[PDB]
Structure 1
Amino acid sequence: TLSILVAHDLQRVIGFENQLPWHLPNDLKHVKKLSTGHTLVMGRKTFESIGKPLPNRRNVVLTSDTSFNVEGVDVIHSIEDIYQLPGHVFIFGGQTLYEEMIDKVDDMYITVIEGKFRGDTFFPPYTFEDWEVASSVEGKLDEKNTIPHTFLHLIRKAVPR
């Protein structure tokens, strides 16, 4: 399977100054649960922002940098390389990767952050006309998680007739 994994706000902001605009531990927990034991594909900037590989899954970084070498990280230099990765592959960001992959993925795991943040990077526009809501679950709010958010699993609709 090839899936998008992303959190975006009400205006599709995903990032600001190479960081997530929001502090929302529950979403990182969500990401962890979905991707553990599988594969994450991310652009070079997204990787540098995280700083190191995420434990207990395959970390793949797309970059044109042929000198790129990081212990625990696998490197690719082409979008086409993604299709050769075995197992469940999650497109993990950032804007460039999403733009390149949104027309190609089977489904998307989207956390809608129910707020308006300042951003400098965005998820591409999409329409629910094209995407079936396989599930929609409200995130629980509390001390550490104070921004309303919704976990969507969207699956690409087939064009019939």
Structure 2
Amino acid sequence: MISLIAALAVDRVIGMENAMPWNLPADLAWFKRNTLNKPVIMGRHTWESIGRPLPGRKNIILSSQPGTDDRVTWVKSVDEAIAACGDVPEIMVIGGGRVYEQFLPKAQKLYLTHIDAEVEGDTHFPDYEPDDWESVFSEFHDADAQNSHSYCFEILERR
């Protein structure tokens, strides 16, 4: 099974200048809980944005060019990325925009955080078709001393 996980600001913005400008510790904790002990697939730009391997996960990087770091696994196509995960119950695709576009048609589940924040961005999560997806979990949180925007964790499953 393939799943996508992402955090979206208003208008589906996910990034600006190869960074995420906000800081929501509760959402990063959610990301860790839902990805630990699973393989994670990311594009090369997202690898550069994170800047180090994510511990406790098999890190798989898509790039058309040879890899430059043997602490992670480098692959050259979507089918190779999936194969490099092996026989696991759930593969997590962690972006960025170009990678989400390619894996969305193959995904059964979306883990989305909706952040109440207006961000000028240059990268968006794909337009997906709402009729294709059932919401099976949602949990709203107001802003607090650690998280400066309200946010909503949602899990969607392909109908």
Identical aligned pairs, as a percentage? 35
| 2:142–2:149 Cα contact (<8 Å) kept | no
CA offset digits 1:26-73 (Å, max 9, x no partner): 11111111011111100000001111101111111000112x131320
Residue of structure 2 equivalent to 1:36: 36
**Alignment-derived partner of residue 121 in structure 1:** 123
**Contact residue 13 and residue 124 of structure 2 kept, 8 A:** yes
Deviates more, 1:9-18 or 1:20-29: 20-29
Q: Are 1:142 and 2:144 matched, yes or no?
A: yes
Q: Name the SS of the counterpart of 1:57 in structure 2.
A: coil
The runs of 5 or more residues in structure 2 that have no matched partner are none
CA drift at 1:140: 5.0
Question: What TM-score, normalized by structure 2, do the two folds share?
Answer: 0.93
With normalisation by structure 1, the TM-score equals 0.92
Q: Which residue of 1 aligns with 2:106?
A: 104
Number of matched residues?
156
| Shift, 1:5, TM fit | 0.6
How far apart, in 2, do the equivalents of 1:114 and 1:102 lie?
23
User: By how many angstroms is 1:117 displaced?
Assistant: 0.8
Q: Cα offset for 1:106?
A: 0.9
1:3 is aligned to 3
**Alpha carbon RMSD of aligned pairs, Å?**
1.2
* Mapped pair 1:75 → 2:74: yes
CA distance in 1, matches of 2:142, 2:35: 20
Q: Find the residue that maps to 1:46 and give its secondary structure.
A: helix
SS in 2 for 1:3: strand
Give 1:128 shift: 2.4
Letter aligned with residue 43 of structure 1: G
Higher helix share: 2
- Where does structure 1 lack aligned partners over 5 or more consecutive residues? none
Q: Is the partner of 1:115 in helix, strand or coil?
A: coil
Mapped partners of 1:23, 1:150: distance in 2: 15
